[PDB]
Ligand binder design. Structure first.
Ligand code: CLA
Ligand code: CLA
Ligand code: CLA
Ligand code: CLA
Ligand code: LMG
Ligand code: 8CT
Lengths: 112, 56
């Protein structure tokens, strides 16, 4: 789903369809760009939405009480779809040798 | 009368009742199979098949 398409939809259409949890994407038609960071201009991130599509857990390979070997197993989502984060924003500063994004807001957690 | 060890001989010459008792025995055996499977599943540990298989 593109941001241009989300604006087209009203809340009544989107409600109860699972599209609210889905993270948008940049269209292939509108791509190949370059977000250049001009000096003398403070920049920041907004709307940083993260939809996880696969969940894996490092589970012990056996129920032995002294099991040290573990592997990543796939899981079923028990919570219904509220897991995607959205609205995350924050500054982009020259903290160190390169640019860095500092997280300072948004939904930015999901108790799944 | 009929002593305790001959009691199931009344159904010797009654084929319908013989089918009935055979059916009851079959029902009990199938019920045992199901119940044993359920209890085993309740107490089974499927985590480790190489050092804790079914036969252990
Ligand atoms: C499927 C096989 C089978 C069948 C259909 C029968 C059928 C019969 N036998 Mg039996 N019998 C069998 C195997 C079988 N027998 C075996 C293997 C033996 C050797 C031990 C005997 C030895 C035997 C004798 C010596 C006599 C009979 C008699 C009888 C008749 C009456 C029994 C009665 O009313 O008991 C009623 C029984 C009770 C009220 C309680 C018995 C409780 C037992 C001992 C313990 C608990 C058993 C448990 C709940 C289930 C067993 C599981 C199984 C896998 C073994 C009846 C026609 C009698 C006969 O011929 O009469 C004319 C008789 O005298 N049978
Ligand atoms: C699946 C096994 C099974 C089956 C199908 C039957 C079938 C029968 N039993 Mg039972 N019986 C069983 C196990 C079984 N018995 C066991 C384990 C015992 C020992 C507790 C008895 C002890 C017993 C007695 C003492 C009598 C019966 C009798 C009967 C009749 C049914 C009477 C009624 O509805 O009550 C029938 C031939 C009666 C019978 O046939 O009398 C002539 C009877 O008096 N049974
Ligand atoms: C072509 C016809 C036919 C068929 C298909 C059968 C089949 C059977 N007879 Mg036999 N039988 C026949 C003719 C037939 N008989 C005739 C003409 C007589 C003389 C009256 C007998 C007398 C006779 C006796 C005295 C006994 C049998 C028993 C059995 C059953 C033993 C196995 C069992 O219980 O499986 C395990 C059971 C199942 C898997 C349950 C489902 C079985 C099927 C798929 C459906 C049953 C429902 C159906 C509508 C019943 C009517 C058909 C009936 C003929 C089976 C078996 C299903 C024995 C019995 O009743 O054991 C319990 C038994 O003691 N038969
Ligand atoms: C091929 C396998 C097979 C065979 C041939 C039989 C045969 C029999 N079963 Mg069945 N049964 C089976 C599988 C089998 N079963 C399975 C898998 C289950 C589920 C666990 C059952 C559960 C079951 C029950 C619940 C009952 C039977 C009964 C019977 C008997 C019915 C006829 C009868 O009354 O005889 C006359 C009786 C006898 C021959 C009794 C002696 C049986 C053996 C030799 C006893 C073994 C010693 C015992 C553990 C200790 C006794 C000590 C003291 C208390 C005397 C017969 C011996 C019924 C029975 O015995 O009713 C009285 C009965 O109640 N069976
Ligand atoms: C009939 C009544 C039977 C109810 C069970 C009473 C026995 C009990 O629970 O003992 C339970 C006790 C164990 O006891 C348990 O564990 C601990 C032991 O220290 C403590 O006692 C706990 O308090 C107690 O919960 O017996 C055992 O050792 C387990 C034996 C297994 C008994 C299962 C019998 C029932 C058969 C199940 C199979 C079904 C398929 C056959 C179909 C017939
Ligand atoms: C004493 C002794 C001697 C030698 C062997 C051993 C040492 C093991 C010991 C034990 C022996 C024996 C013979 C034990 C056997 C135990 C047995 C046969 C137990 C029976 C179990 C059966 C059960 C639950 C059946 C369950 C059935 C149910 C709900 C049916 C319900 C239903 C009905 C009735 C109508 C249709 C709908 C529906 C819901 C399916």
């Amino acid at each position: 789903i593109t941001t241009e398409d989300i604006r087209g939809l009203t809340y009544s259409q989107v409600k109860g369809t699972g599209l609210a949890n889905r993270c948008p994407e940049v269209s292939e038609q509108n791509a190949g760009g370059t977000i250049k960071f001009a000096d003398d201009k403070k920049y920041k991130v907004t709307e940083l939405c993260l939809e996880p599509k696969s969940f894996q857990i490092e589970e012990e390979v056996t129920k032995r009480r002294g099991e040290t070997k573990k592997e990543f197993v796939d899981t079923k989502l028990m919570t219904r779809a509220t897991y995607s984060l959205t609205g995350i924003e924050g500054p982009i500063v020259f903290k160190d040798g390169g640019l860095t994004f500092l997280e300072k807001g948004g939904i930015d957690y999901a108790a799944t | 009368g009929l002593p305790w060890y001959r009691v199931h001989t009344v159904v010797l010459n009654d084929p319908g009742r013989l089918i009935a008792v055979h059916l009851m025995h079959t029902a009990l055996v199938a019920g045992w199979a199901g119940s044993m499977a359920l209890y085993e599943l309740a107490v089974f540990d499927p985590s480790d098949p190489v050092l804790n298989p079914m036969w252990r």
